[PDB]
Structure formats: C-alpha cells, structure tokens
Amino acid sequence: VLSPADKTNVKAAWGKVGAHAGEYGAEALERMFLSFPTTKTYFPHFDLSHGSAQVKGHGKKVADALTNAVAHVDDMPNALSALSDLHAHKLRVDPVNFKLLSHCLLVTLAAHLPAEFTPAVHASLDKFLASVSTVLTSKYR
Amino acid sequence: VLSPADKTNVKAAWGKVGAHAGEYGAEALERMFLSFPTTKTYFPHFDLSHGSAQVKGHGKKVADALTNAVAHVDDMPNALSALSDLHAHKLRVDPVNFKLLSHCLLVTLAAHLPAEFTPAVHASLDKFLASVSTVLTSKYR
Amino acid sequence: VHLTPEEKSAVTALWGKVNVDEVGGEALGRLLVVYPWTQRFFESFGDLSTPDAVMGNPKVKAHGKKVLGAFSDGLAHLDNLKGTFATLSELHCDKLHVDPENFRLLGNVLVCVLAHHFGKEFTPPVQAAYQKVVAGVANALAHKYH
Amino acid sequence: VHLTPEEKSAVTALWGKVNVDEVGGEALGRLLVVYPWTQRFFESFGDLSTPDAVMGNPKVKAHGKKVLGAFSDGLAHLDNLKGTFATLSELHCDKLHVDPENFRLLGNVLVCVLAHHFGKEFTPPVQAAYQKVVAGVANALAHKYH
Numbered sequence A, B: 001v002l003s004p005a006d007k008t009n010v011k012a013a014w015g016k017v018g019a020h021a022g023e024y025g026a027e028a029l030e031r032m033f034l035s036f037p038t039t040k041t042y043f044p045h046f047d048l049s050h051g052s053a054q055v056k057g058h059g060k061k062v063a064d065a066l067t068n069a070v071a072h073v074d075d076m077p078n079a080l081s082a083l084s085d086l087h088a089h090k091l092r093v094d095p096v097n098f099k100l101l102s103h104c105l106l107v108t109l110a111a112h113l114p115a116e117f118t119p120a121v122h123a124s125l126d127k128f129l130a131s132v133s134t135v136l137t138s139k140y141r
Numbered sequence C, D: 001v002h003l004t005p006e007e008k009s010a011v012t013a014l015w016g017k018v019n020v021d022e023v024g025g026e027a028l029g030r031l032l033v034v035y036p037w038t039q040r041f042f043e044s045f046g047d048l049s050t051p052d053a054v055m056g057n058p059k060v061k062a063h064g065k066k067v068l069g070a071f072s073d074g075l076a077h078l079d080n081l082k083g084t085f086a087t088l089s090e091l092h093c094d095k096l097h098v099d100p101e102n103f104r105l106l107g108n109v110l111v112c113v114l115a116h117h118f119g120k121e122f123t124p125p126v127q128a129a130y131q132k133v134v135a136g137v138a139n140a141l142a143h144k145y146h
C-alpha cells in the first residue's frame, strides 16, 4: 500500500499538527467550499455562518480519523471502514472531494510548518492523503 | 509495482495480439491523433497519408516494447529506459499522451478479443498500461 | 463537437445498429469493473461486485439506456450541448455532486464497447467521432460547474 | 474568475507583498518535488533531482518569475483570460504539447506556497480567490485545446 519514509514525514507533520488538528480540519473544509465551488452543489445542511459549532466538531472528527490513519497507516484498510460506510452508504461523497480538502489541509499545514513543500513532505502528504482517500473509498471491507 | 493476476490477463490478451501487435500499435497512434486532437499540436514530422510506411514501423516498435513490458512486467524499470530516454531527453512527450494511445490499444484489442472489458482484463490493461507509462516515465534509471 | 458529415455518418450509422441496452450495459459495466470511484454508486445498481453481477445487472443496463439515450439526444441535436443536457448537468450536480471525472471515464469507455460490439467496423475516425460527441457530453454535464 | 472586490483586495494585496522569484521558485519547486510528469522537463531546469537542487535552482526561480508574471497579467486584466494568455496557450501547445493537467497542478501548488510564505494572512477566501484566478489561468493555457 505505502512506503517507510512517507510515514516518517506524516508523523513529523502530524506531530506539529497536535491539538491544532481539529482547527486545520475545520479550515480545510471551509477552504474546500470556497476554493472548489462544486462542493456547495452537494446541498450541505451546514450553516457556514462564521465560527460554526458544527464545523469545529466535524473538523475534530476528520482530524481524529487522520490521527487514526497516522496510527495505523499500513493497517487502516478496515480502521476507516465506518467512514467509508458513511461516504459511500450515505451521501455518495465523491472521493475526488477528498483530494480538494487534502490540498486544503496541506495548505493550512504549510501556514504553520517549516516548509511543508519538501520532496519528502509534499510527495508524502499528497500520496498519504491519496491512501487515506483509497482506504475511505474501500469496498464492503 | 504490480499484481500477479494482472500479468495473466496481459499475457492472455497479448497472446491473441501475437503478429497483430504492430498493426494495433499503428492503429492506436492514428486513433490517438483523431480521438485526442491535442497530439496534432506536437507538430509530428509524420505524413499520416493513409497506409503510412512510418506508422506500421513505429507500430511494430511500440508493440515490441509492449512485448518487452509483458516479458519483464515486474522487471521492466530499466528495460524501457531507452524509450524513457527518448520520450524525456527528446521531444518531452507528456506521459498523459501514453494514456490516450493505451485507451486506443484497449479499443483495438476489444475489436478482436472475446470481451476485453472484464474486471480482470480491463482493470489489468488499464493498470498495466499505467505501469508501462510509469516505467517509460522513470528518471535517469 | 460539430463532426464532419462523413464522421457523423460513421458514428450515427454505428449508433443506428447499436444495441442501446447491451452496449449500455457493457459501457457502464466496462467502467464499473475497473473498481473506480463510480463503484461508490454500486448500491443503486444493486449488482456490480463480480463480472457476472455487473454485466447481467438489469439496473446497469437500464441506467446504460438513460446515459446513452442522452448521448443520442446529443447526435440528434449537436446544435445544443448546453440546453438538451442542462437538466442532466443539474441532476449531475445540484442532486448528485458526483465528480465529472466519472463522466469523462464513462464517455471514454463507451467508445471502447462500440469497437468491441462492431470490431469489423470500428474505424480510426468513427472512434474519434464518438469521442468528439462524448467529450461534448462530459463538458455538457460539467457545464453547471461554471 | 471575476472575484468579489474584498476577495480581489485579499489576493492582490497578498500579491503586492509576494516575493515573485522566491514564491515562484517555491511554487515551481513544490510542484517539481512530487516527482510528477513535470519532472520530464528537469533538463531545461538543469537542477531538480534533490530538494536543495530544485529549491536553489536559478532556472526554477526564473521560470517561476515567468509563470507568476503571467498570473499577475491575470490579476491586472481579468477582463481578458482569452487574449492576454493566448501567446502562452500557443507556446503551451503549438511548441510545447505538455498536458494542461500540469498547469492545474502548478496552479493548485501556487496557492499553497503563498499560504506558507504568508501563513498569518492565508484566509479561507484568499486561497480560494487565488484558486479562481488560477483555475482561470489553467483554462486560459488550455484554451488552444478547443
């Protein structure tokens, strides 16, 4: 599924993400709505009324599921299955959307980390978020 | 790099491709020019004047390099290197073009094979031609 | 799109013999069996998880009839590609956000099954002629993404 | 594209402080270091094969100045996006067939380095505002693919 050095660059990035994880998830969603107008076509039931209590909570959940991906990055095929069963068995959330929010994360991470755009960190976080996508878009298992 | 069953579906397809390999390469190129007009933007030095002596010869070479990929499908990283050194060190041939000609092959193969669109054969030939791309688009090695 | 009259004759006469339910079942089948992002809709198809499941699925054949019936509304009205498909471009965002990358693949895949089903007739320009209508169809469903 | 006046103020004032050579070196660097299809042009850059190679390459910085200088010709003339870029859309096909998938990535990547370089100022709409100009820029270079 993945490589050894990519995990190290993810664990390093996610280590400075720390408690900020939920805020970067929240920002990455708001960013995806603004920076890819097509996601407003999903008819979100959310308010997006600035400072939104639902976006910070969803942000923490997306972030904790990213922590779960970091904790299990070669072992996550079933550990994100409840989130696959969400994005598939409800709403039909296209995995192409994931790439947009993931760009939005990479950007927000770059707003706080040393470079974030190195070969080791950019190739890693693009292909790691791509495997988080691949595993969120698994079948029945 | 790849999977075991994909090789079997490639070897099966390429087995009925046989002597027709060069003609399917030739057709796949002409098809890519017509079906993806952007390749005419490469300013080809070729004539494309029907029955072209250069397209049948290039077709046989593309096809023999596909035979070389089939013969070495997990061992080709350097065996297509002369063709990488072509597509990179000359003309800058974008690997996105490869996907277009590969669709064009899959189509021409389907015009002669039983289904060609099975899960085992379509997933295989899409991801095999994608690895032929990945290996034609290797670095210095 | 706007094909040349000989290209139009080639694509529309291949359409004229086309088995819309079975070329549609096998177009939509051919796409679905790569296990791509369109497999997320496998629950509305009800069968896809195996070759025999997707190829024999009455819902993949029926949905095949709808996607290709619209493709034919294309070949009947190529002067539109902005109004004939607009209800589809709406469906395929305002109710189904589902990314148009998926439409590009269905399109590409359609040309392939036609060349399977009519492999003695699959000429270099007929497949491209198909692709010009198809690239139109994907751009038309994607219009609502302005 | 056609951003709202507050969005325009945000993107163009972030442009107004932008280090065009170093944000350009790091935009083009950020793209090049994923080892994507744009690495096939590494021979014209002359350095890319390592982090220090691409980030310090005078040719990646200089080419960064050209791509982003054109992006600024965008923010100066958003009423065009069809004539200001047309010589580039020509260069980027009629002399460089190089696929516009590559332009979409450079574009996306550009917004990211701006948010690195000005991370205290990288607002949710400023990055999207960038992306609206950028998606315009990629569509403008892709215009010649009609």
Ligand code: HEM
Pocket (backbone or CB within 6 Å): A039, A058, A061, A062, A063, A065, A066, A082, A083, A086, A091, A093, A094, A095, A097, A098, A099, A101, A132, A136
């Ligand atoms: C970075 C990858 C993502 C992760 C890890 C993730 C994680 C989650 C989690 C943990 C939940 C809460 C419910 C549950 O326990 O399953 C959730 C809800 C949701 N997700 Fe995601 N998600 C991701 C990507 C996406 C994408 C691409 C979209 C599309 C815009 C999306 C849209 C939603 C929506 C609409 C909900 C339901 C809101 C609610 O809680 O009522 N997610 N996601």
Ligand code: HEM
Pocket (backbone or CB within 6 Å): B039, B058, B061, B062, B063, B065, B066, B082, B083, B086, B091, B093, B094, B095, B097, B098, B099, B101, B132, B136
């Ligand atoms: C299916 C993958 C492909 C294979 C296996 C392949 C193979 C070859 C081979 C063997 C040659 C002859 C020279 C040599 O020995 O290196 C060649 C020439 C060439 N290829 Fe490809 N090729 C492929 C894809 C492409 C693509 C995507 C294009 C772009 C349209 C392309 C354009 C050319 C051109 C322009 C030449 C030079 C013509 C000449 O022989 O003077 N090739 N290729």
Ligand code: HEM
Pocket (backbone or CB within 6 Å): C037, C038, C041, C044, C066, C067, C068, C070, C071, C087, C088, C091, C096, C098, C102, C103, C104, C106, C107, C137, C138, C141
């Ligand atoms: C690009 C070729 C395609 C065309 C022209 C097309 C056309 C159509 C048509 C004509 C309908 C029915 C319209 C109606 O009842 O008002 C439809 C429905 C639908 N299509 Fe497509 N389609 C295409 C591609 C796709 C793809 C690839 C997907 C999957 C990702 C998709 C998913 C759907 C769904 C889910 C429905 C059912 C919506 C409903 O009525 O509840 N289509 N399509």
Ligand code: HEM
Pocket (backbone or CB within 6 Å): D037, D038, D041, D044, D066, D067, D068, D070, D071, D087, D088, D091, D096, D098, D102, D103, D104, D106, D107, D137, D138, D141
């Ligand atoms: C989407 C953002 C981009 C813009 C706006 C852009 C703009 C430019 C500009 C202004 C020039 C010089 C024009 C001239 O001298 O007449 C140029 C040259 C060039 N660009 Fe881009 N570019 C972009 C993306 C790319 C990408 C991603 C690639 C690589 C795949 C690329 C490859 C080239 C090459 C090879 C040249 C040099 C051609 C020559 O003059 O010999 N550009 N670019």
